[PDB]
Amino acid sequence: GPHSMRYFETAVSRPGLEEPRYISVGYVDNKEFVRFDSDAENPRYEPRAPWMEQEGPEYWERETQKAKGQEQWFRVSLRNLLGYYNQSAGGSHTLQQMSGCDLGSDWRLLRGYLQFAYEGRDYIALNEDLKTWTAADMAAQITRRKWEQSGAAEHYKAYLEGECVEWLHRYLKNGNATLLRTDSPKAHVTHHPRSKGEVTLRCWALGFYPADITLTWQLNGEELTQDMELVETRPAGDGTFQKWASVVVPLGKEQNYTCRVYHEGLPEPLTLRWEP
């Protein structure tokens, strides 16, 4: 088991809205686990998984305070971005941030992430070295300099190597039952006759976590990028996921067609075909 933590922050300005709305969402192993929202009647970080109600109110006060500081930081940053891009007033704008760390199965640090986006587009990001910055846009160079000048990278580096890691370990223990495993998928093939002499074999995969999964149809051993049909992986809404892949098939000549399904909770991949 390798692991991760992330914090996805967003601030949105809308043309007449007074102040931007700030929203921060924490993820441990891709599962939402805390959340702050400035629109809430009383803005505070709330827990979002059972295992987090294990945390004493001093924790929630500190975090909630950080949030209020972040809210102000996004405010000022949004304001400067307007100027950097020579945008006038009365438009909609978005500033986003992803921050966090990845751990090996040894629980050591693998990568730190620190990235920003403006209007949904990459604006500036801390490189893997955690010392240098990437920023494509001409307007973004102003920021790259201000932050090179001021040792911003060392600050974010410290968080990413210390606090991000230390606290992720702590969170990992405190719900060491909730996350330890993964829900394998259950598969089956459905039959749908369509045109004269042709059928749709649609291989489903249901009730799996996490979402990463691959589905492949084989003609006896030969895979198909030749007009196989799929859908983006989608949540069932119960905390598990669904995907299907289908292909065009001669009616009758249909046991030559094997769907394979690959997922991490699987001991080994599933081979299936149509069972009437």
């Binding site: 975090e63 950080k66 949030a67 000022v76 921050s99 932050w147 911003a152 974010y156 968080y159 606090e163």
Partner: peptide, 9 residues
């Protein structure tokens, strides 16, 4: 722990 940012953008 949420991170906290250095200087604004």
């Amino acid at each position: 722990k949420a991170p906290y940012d250095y200087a604004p953008i």
